[PDB]
């Protein structure tokens, strides 16, 4: 999961920022989907994708990380890029999942 959501390189640096999240998963009180949501709603995600990229490139990365694909068509680019404006990154991530 760390490698999917962050990239490989950033995932290496992770020591235990998410240790509390891991425990809830280990406990089987959260699902894997929920765990992926919360990795997305994280300062680390935001710092590594959102903050140094224009909003279009942000939608790319989100598609890559949460669905494994690029953006299929201009209508899809509109819908998601739209929602990223006028709401958080936390909204985008939440919509995909």
């Amino acid at each position: 999961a760390y490698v999917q959501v962050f990239d490989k390189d950033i995932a290496s640096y992770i020591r235990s920022e998410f240790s509390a999240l891991e425990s809830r998963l280990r406990n089987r009180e959260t699902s894997v989907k929920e765990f992926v949501r919360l990795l997305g709603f994280s300062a680390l995600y935001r710092k590594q994708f959102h903050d140094r990229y224009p909003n279009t490139k942000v939608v790319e990365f989100a598609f890559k990380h949460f669905l494994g694909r690029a953006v299929k068509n201009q209508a899809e680019l509109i819908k998601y890029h739209g929602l990223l404006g006028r709401k958080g990154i936390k909204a985008l991530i939440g919509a995909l999942v």
Binding site: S19, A20, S23, N27, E29
Partner: protein, 160 residues
Amino acid sequence: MQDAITAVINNYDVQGKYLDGAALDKLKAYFTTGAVRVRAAAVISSNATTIIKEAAAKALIYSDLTRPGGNMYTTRRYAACIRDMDYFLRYATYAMLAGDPSILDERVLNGLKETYNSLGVPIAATVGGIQAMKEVVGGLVGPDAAKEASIYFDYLSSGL
């Protein structure tokens, strides 16, 4: 979560009442305590690792728990227990700044008893550890801060 200031606001909002002097006095009380709390929080953050170490030494280690067949036996279990200790400390610090116990309920306290019972973690020993942390914290923070710090530690203990 909720804090002291927001708690007052919310009580007034359900009544629909504008803020009144009595309410203001409660807010004013918090504001005086605030400066002390900030100092205490900084102390705790800096000494957090040691606080946990000392508390473990007081209760957890050199005990049946650490000995084979004990709950905290094996490295994995030992590490888990000290991780939990850290959680309690961090949340108590948050609560102390906030001036409200609610955050403890919302994050730490909810479902913990049930989790521990399924795991077979001993609640009384955990409570003992929390009380030990409180004592260590009390020293570092100093007396005025200690009273404030103690209530949140006691709240955690009672919940568990």
